[PDB]
Amino acid sequence: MDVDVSTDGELPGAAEYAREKIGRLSRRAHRPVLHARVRLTRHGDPAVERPVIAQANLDVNGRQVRAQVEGVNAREAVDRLEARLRSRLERIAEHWEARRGGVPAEAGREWRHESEPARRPGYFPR
Amino acid sequence: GSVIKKRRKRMSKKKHRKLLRRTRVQRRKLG
């Protein structure tokens, strides 16, 4: 997994840490990752309690996955971003194991939006 | 009542039972 990091201003070593942390998420993605971008920014105002902002974007086989966090320094922001991305990838899975509980089951028990409608005869049962 | 309290109690109970299982022979030999 190849990641490009577009930082700004002063954030020494943030790029390497972010690359190494984010690149570990490829195995979690159930489909090949086409692109991955990370941006690190810092807030100019000292009054901001969490100045560093980290954002990510992954192209998981055409599905866009993005997250954004805030932290007090580069390392914390990158770690929180990794956590958020992992959660998103978990919720995105869409393979069989991820949609086996949502497929309608039974015959008459339970009803869902895509549940098969019951077949009805022309004449009333009586 | 929320099931959260039941969850806390059950985790404490499960951990204690695991601890008891892990040291059965040691307790028998010391007692």
Binding site: G102, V103, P104, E114, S115, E116 | -
Partner: protein, 153 residues
């Protein structure tokens, strides 16, 4: 098409042949709005067919259309959270559209050095039942038949 069907465009009859089908054909071969070139191509192909066989071109064009017109097609259907290739009956208009599109495309990938010649050869072989469009109808019917188990929904 969420709120209902949309009206169809009533295209006019052709002047030099008086048939709906040739206008449909010229609109199928039309590219970039150069309608005059499309009409020249279609008329040239019809005249080539008339010269080769010696009879009216519209009758052989209709014969080719009937030879390549499909009747059964396959569409992916999602019923109860599962997708399958379900054979579906084809309406007459969609069958004519599919036949014309197949004819035009398969003539576009012929090897007769000119689109008029390619089109004429394709329509002639479709009339005689040897075109690649005829073949394509054969495989589409075969695929529709091979999935007949799913026709119940």
């Amino acid at each position: 098409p969420r709120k209902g069907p949309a009206p169809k465009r009533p295209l006019v009859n052709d002047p030099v042949y008086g048939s709906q089908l040739v206008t449909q054909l010229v609109n199928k071969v039309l590219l970039e709005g150069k309608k005059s070139l499309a009409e020249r191509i279609v008329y040239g192909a019809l005249e080539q067919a008339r010269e080769k066989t010696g009879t009216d071109p519209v009758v052989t064009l209709k014969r080719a259309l009937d030879n390549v017109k499909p009747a059964l097609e396959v569409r992916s259907r999602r019923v109860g959270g599962a997708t399958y290739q379900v054979p579906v009956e084809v309406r007459p208009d969609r069958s004519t559209t599919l036949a014309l599109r197949w004819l035009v495309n398969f003539s576009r990938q012929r090897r007769e050095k000119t689109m008029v010649e390619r089109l004429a050869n394709e329509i002639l072989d479709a009339s005689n039942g040897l075109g690649a469009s005829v073949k394509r109808r054969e495989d589409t019917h075969k695929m529709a038949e091979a999935n007949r188990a799913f026709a119940h929904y």
